[PDB]
Amino acid sequence: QPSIGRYTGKPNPSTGKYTVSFIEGDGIGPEISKSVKKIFSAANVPIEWESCDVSPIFVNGLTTIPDPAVQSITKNLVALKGPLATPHRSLNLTLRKTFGLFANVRPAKSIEGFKTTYENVDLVLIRENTEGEYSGIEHIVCPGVVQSIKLITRDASERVIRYAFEYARAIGRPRVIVVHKSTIQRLADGLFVNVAKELSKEYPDLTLETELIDNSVLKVVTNPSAYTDAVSVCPNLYGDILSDLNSGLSAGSLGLTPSANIGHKISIFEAVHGSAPDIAGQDKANPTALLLSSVMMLNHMGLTNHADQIQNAVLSTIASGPENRTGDLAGTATTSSFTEAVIKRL
């Protein structure tokens, strides 16, 4: 397990059950969270929930996160949130700032037995979350001229890059590939690559390659499998675009995609799809994305046995046979029929 954002263990002194904040979110949030609890109870995992509300409170006009949830998550050190709709400042952006979340882990894997347009893709991308265009400033200089100001620092970089190494080691992959843009015509990418080379020597079991973002997308799209022995890191700039391109390779959408937001102590795990309100209540939601984030969360906690149980068999294998799946995957099942269909092979 990665030393960088290590989980401080400690089950509940009395129940022998780990405390985990929730945040069920909204839209299809409720019914997808329900499904996660029924599969966590049915597989008997050492976890008691604690649903939080993160509705954006305002303090000085600067969006702030409610104190009930802050204390809950700071204490539990882990959270598992579902989707939430778009209200001043960014809801996701303040979430990362308050809990010190610096790395975003975005797996994109093909589903065995489910025919998608690309095959045998198993991609892992770690992107920086602190600086870049997230901490960016825009202003009008002369009357028709926007200037943008973006920052990159050695500190924030030597941190997603450490984590990328420790995560490659922790899931058994030989190569970490730093992705960047023309290194000589941008000394911002030059700094990111140099920081990667400095850390290269503290991880001799791992091979560091560097690649132009141009080449990476050309290669990954012609042949995704060529990267299933690697973990990619990139600066915050291209993170958004690359991770969404990976999900297009694995699935053709964000529908089946898990994500992890790792901080020094806290770590939040979430699906990346929307609230999709116009399908809420109707029981058509697909809990796979949130389920797979559960797996990532388990693995981050050390419950490896339960992680593989709930992932290995379960939804991975149940996604085989069309009378399962869900409306999104040209299937026929319902969010209820899916949940126990998974508990079947649980």
Partner: protein, 335 residues
């Protein structure tokens, strides 16, 4: 039944650039085209006397055909020549054509997108500085006159080649001001000046996902400098590689034709695919007003690659670039 020879600048590039450039030279003499090359030698992508000579030659001839350097600089749009073309000649629009070819095994069939990218601003005109140690700061500009140009260029292009959709690709969700300016100017120029053409917008991260999953929904993509390279490489992968991608670069007074992907990922003697260079060659011919010649040359290469024989190794063949050229020349004499 004409009466002149066009002098056009020829900048072959490195070794492979010379191979594929020579293919075009060979096809052109064989077709007896009224074109005299004014061939310029630059060494590095930064050889100062060569860049000056190339610029000076384009100033005289206005039209140019350009091969590759497979240094990282040429492939990304930097390096002395590219910045000279952009700063001195004001060549502001890069065009790349991604059409699927009849005999190339691709995971997604029948692709037809065009990517037009702004070439004088954003990535290409910043400032970067390290003022306190370990902190790098970028300062980039987006301006309304530059974006108006690129908009009109893209619409005018759609008009001329009967395209029905122009989609601006931007990141206005985060960069609300600069990329917002870009999205707005494109969509306004669409509604007031080009009503017959469908304008739309897409956030670049969604456009990346959408391009590898459902490419058919797109027609003409217009983007700032920073996203064009990424969209263009998805485009190249979609149709079977950089070897297949025609390209052109325009300014008000100058045009320079060259492979649209800069052969980014595309090793050995006489093995490289000359198709991108040849197809870029035909864009040049159309532009010059020839293009009877262009239709023939184009038919010849499509026909050649359609029949899996004599095809080069990157599209599943085993023939050399020379074999492929000769096959093309062969179908030309019998047509």
């Amino acid at each position: 039944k004409y009466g002149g020879r066009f002098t056009v600048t020829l900048i072959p590039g490195d070794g492979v650039g010379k191979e594929i450039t020579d293919s075009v030279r060979t096809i052109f003499e064989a077709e007896n085209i009224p074109i005299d090359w004014e061939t310029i030698n630059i060494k590095q992508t930064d050889h100062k006397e060569g860049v000056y000579e190339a610029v000076e030659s384009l100033k005289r001839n206005k039209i140019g055909l350009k091969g590759l350097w497979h240094t990282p600089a040429d492939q990304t749009g930097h390096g002395s020549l590219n910045v000279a073309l952009r700063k001195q000649l004001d060549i502001y629009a890069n065009v790349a054509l991604f059409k699927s070819l009849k005999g190339v095994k691709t995971r997604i069939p029948d692709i037809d997108l065009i990517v037009i990218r702004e070439n004088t601003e954003g990535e290409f005109s910043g400032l970067e500085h390290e003022s306190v140690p370990g902190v790098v700061e970028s300062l980039k500009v987006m301006t309304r006159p530059k974006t108006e140009r690129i908009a009109r260029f893209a619409f005018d292009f759609a008009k001329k080649y009967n395209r029905k959709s122009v989609t601006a690709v931007h990141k206005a969700n985060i960069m609300k001001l600069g990329d917002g300016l870009f999205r707005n100017i494109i969509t306004e120029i669409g509604q007031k000046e080009y009503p017959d053409i469908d304008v739309s917008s897409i956030i670049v991260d969604n456009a990346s996902m959408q391009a590898v999953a459902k490419p058919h929904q797109f027609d003409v993509l217009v983007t700032p400098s920073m996203y064009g390279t990424i969209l263009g490489n998805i485009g190249a992968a979609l149709i079977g590689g950089p070897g297949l991608v025609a390209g052109a670069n325009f300014g008000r007074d100058y045009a320079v034709f060259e492979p649209g992907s800069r052969h980014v990922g595309l090793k050995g003697q006489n093995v490289a695919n000359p198709t991108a260079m040849i197809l870029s060659s035909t864009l040049m011919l159309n532009h010059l007003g020839l293009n009877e010649y262009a239709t023939r040359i184009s038919k010849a290469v499509h026909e050649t690659i359609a029949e899996g024989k004599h095809t080069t190794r990157d599209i599943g063949g085993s023939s050399s670039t020379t074999d492929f050229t000769n096959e093309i020349i062969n179908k030309l004499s019998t047509m």
